[PDB]
């Protein structure tokens, strides 16, 4: 999803 990939721990 690149920028939209999971940005969390």
């Amino acid at each position, epitope marked *: 999803a690149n920028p939209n990939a999971n940005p969390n*721990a």
Partner: antibody, heavy 122, light 108 residues
Framework: VQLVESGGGVVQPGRSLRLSCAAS????????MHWVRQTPGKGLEWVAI????????YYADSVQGRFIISRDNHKNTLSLQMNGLRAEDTAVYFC????????????????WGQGTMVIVSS | VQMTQSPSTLSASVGDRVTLTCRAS??????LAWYQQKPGKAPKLLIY???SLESGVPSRFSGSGSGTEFTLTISSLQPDDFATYYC??????????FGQGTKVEIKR
């Protein structure tokens, strides 16, 4: 549980302004975080994202090269450095947390600050 | 991905069933969220993943749709539901973009 933005105000065009957002009541270092802005005459416009550990950042084209997003997971703050401000950056700026999720994809925006107003006018 | 909300504003009375529509210019699967916003306040998340209800949001709110066509339904409007409702896509490689909102306002 809250996000509280600061640093807004009146800034001349071309000049610079740093916004800050103080997060409390949650595990801030585990969350991706965003800036979203709103003028009255356009709706909501996404501005920038930063990964939980600071390792990835992405920007909207309208601000690419002029804005910098950063975070301090020790003081639990998000910041937006805004350089070369234009009249069209006048907006309320919201600090925004992504809804937590597992698996490969990001999620909606589940927690918002009250916003801080920046007025770019000479 | 451009998000389209029509109509931009809509009159209704307490008790009415209200349906808001949101069209996406390309398929976004189910990566769609709905927010409510009142004047001077931050948007509040109502629905995520196009049909999952956010914690603490009352059950008269429901969402449906996939692909390019989504709707938000208020089964019976209550007095604190007059507001602006935004949809927003968070699809893979699509960054984040919002509809222009549908402002639900009280009749006459």
């Amino acid at each position: 549980v809250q996000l509280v933005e600061s640093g807004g105000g009146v800034v001349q065009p071309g000049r610079s302004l740093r916004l800050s957002c103080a997060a409390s009541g949650f595990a801030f270092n585990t969350y991706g975080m965003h800036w979203v802005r709103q003028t009255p005459g356009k709706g909501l416009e996404w501005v920038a994202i930063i990964w939980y550990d600071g390792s990835q950042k992405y920007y909207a084209d309208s601000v690419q090269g002029r804005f910098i997003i950063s975070r301090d997971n020790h003081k639990n703050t998000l910041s937006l450095q805004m350089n070369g401000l234009r009249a069209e950056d006048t907006a309320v700026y919201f600090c925004v947390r992504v809804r937590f999720s597992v698996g490969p994809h990001g999620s909606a925006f589940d927690l918002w600050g009250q916003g801080t107003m920046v007025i770019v006018s000479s | 991905v451009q998000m389209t909300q029509s109509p931009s504003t809509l009159s209704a009375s307490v008790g009415d069933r209200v349906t808001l529509t949101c069209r996406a210019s390309q398929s976004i699967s189910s990566w769609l969220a709905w927010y409510q916003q009142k004047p001077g306040k931050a948007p509040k998340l109502l629905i995520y993943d196009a049909s999952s209800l956010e914690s603490g949001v009352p059950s008269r709110f429901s969402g449906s749709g996939s692909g390019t066509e989504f709707t938000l339904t208020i089964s019976s409007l209550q007095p604190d539901d007059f507001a602006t409702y935004y949809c927003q896509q968070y699809n893979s490689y699509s960054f984040w973009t919002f509809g222009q909102g549908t402002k639900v306002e009280i009749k006459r």
